[PDB]
């Protein structure tokens, strides 16, 4: 019983950053070997845990939050960061534990792409994980842009450990 990472990383449709969706993964084998050894990833950064130890530790559950953003804002999906996305679309908690995975999706998402939206105007700051749907602007991703403008698909795997059986373990 392997965890449904394919439903997170091999999905055809991704949420926009202003309205990111998520999957809750539990009661399965979290074989992370599939992800950290993947040649599709441009970046992979973990907070509080080394990637090579992910298969040696258990969680109550994990949350896979996924969305598409422009490449030069990939650095904002981290604790302690600021910026329009960090502040008004996906607030990443400063005590975050988990891994952030991202890759270049230019060959899937760009168009010769008025689909993915992010916030421009938000009256106040978000608290961690508080997605809000209600102002918004299209990225308009193109096939002929630099890496900072090309779309990067992002998956954030947060790790939750509670007074629970801890059923999400690697091999």
């Amino acid at each position: 019983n392997l965890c449904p990472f394919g439903e997170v990383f091999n999905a055809t449709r991704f949420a926009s950053v202003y309205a990111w969706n998520r999957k809750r993964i539990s009661n399965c084998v979290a074989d992370y070997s599939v992800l950290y050894n993947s040649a599709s990833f441009s970046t992979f950064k973990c907070y509080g845990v080394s990637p090579t130890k992910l298969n040696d530790l258990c969680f109550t559950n994990v949350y896979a939050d996924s969305f598409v953003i422009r490449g030069d804002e990939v650095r904002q999906i981290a604790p302690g960061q600021t910026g329009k996305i960090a502040d008004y679309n996906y607030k990443l908690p400063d005590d975050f534990t988990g891994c952030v995975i991202a890759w270049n999706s230019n060959n899937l998402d760009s168009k010769v792409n008025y689909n993915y939206l992010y916030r421009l105007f938000r009256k106040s700051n978000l608290k961690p994980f508080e997605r809000d749907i209600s102002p918004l602007q299209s990225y308009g991703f193109q096939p002929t842009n630099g890496v900072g403008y090309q779309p990067y698909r992002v998956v954030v795997l947060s790790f939750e450990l509670l007074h629970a059986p801890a059923t999400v373990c690697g091999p």
Epitope: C46, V49, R75, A78, V147, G148
Partner: antibody
């Protein structure tokens, strides 16, 4: 951590060279190896980086198609090889103090000795 | 390429663009003594490894501050940052300043 590179060598111009680099220190926090070169009297130029886990590597556009980098997990080495200058080629591990793994905002902290290749 | 003064007798400047420094990406600093590989002195905006130095960013520019004319640290200083243009990820080192 320690990164040991190859010694100096001379090749005929137009030929190929293979430069090894072995991360013998530990390899426990090394996820990626980058290569940077420095021509005599010049500054440093990034040439490429390989992620040891995935085997994927990115390259500077100016040398694309004539450079390859191979990660050999079994020996903890990264091979930098070129086809078809007299620059010094340095091996360095990527590192970031805020997170484990690799990314764009990381830095090259531990550098090898530098292998010169001349014609 | 990041622009730097050929030499400084103090502070070492580093000027880029909004595709690399004004982009928000971290600017790292190195000290290269002749005969060897460069040593990192600043990671991120202003963190440092064990073993006098500070720095900051402003707009599309960044700078390294070295205080005290100690010994003879006539090293070649370089700035490094991630460039988000071209047609793919690349890292850029500055021209290099002799101190």
């Amino acid at each position: 951590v320690q990164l040991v590179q190859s010694g100096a060598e001379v090749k005929k111009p137009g030929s190929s060279v293979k430069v090894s680099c072995k991360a013998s220190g530990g390899i426990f926090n090394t996820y990626t190896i980058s290569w940077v070169r420095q021509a005599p009297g010049q500054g440093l130029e990034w040439m490429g980086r390989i992620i040891l886990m995935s085997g994927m590597a990115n390259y500077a556009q100016k040398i694309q198609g004539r450079v390859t980098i191979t990660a050999d997990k079994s020996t903890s080495t990264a091979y930098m090889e070129l086809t078809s200058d007299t620059a010094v080629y340095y091996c360095a591990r990527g590192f970031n103090g805020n997170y484990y793994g690799w990314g764009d905002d990381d830095a090259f902290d531990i550098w090898g000795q530098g292998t010169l290749v001349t014609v | 390429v990041l622009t730097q003064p050929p030499s400084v007798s103090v502070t070492i400047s580093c000027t880029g663009s909004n595709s690399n420094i004004g982009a928000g990406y971290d600017v790292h600093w190195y000290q290269q003594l002749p005969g060897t590989a460069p040593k990192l002195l600043i990671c991120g905006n202003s963190n440092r490894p064990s073993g006098r130095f500070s720095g900051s960013k402003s707009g599309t520019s960044a700078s390294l501050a070295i205080t005290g004319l100690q010994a003879e640290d006539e090293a070649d200083y370089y700035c490094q940052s991630y460039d988000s243009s071209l047609s793919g990820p690349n890292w850029v080192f500055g021209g290099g300043t002799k101190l």
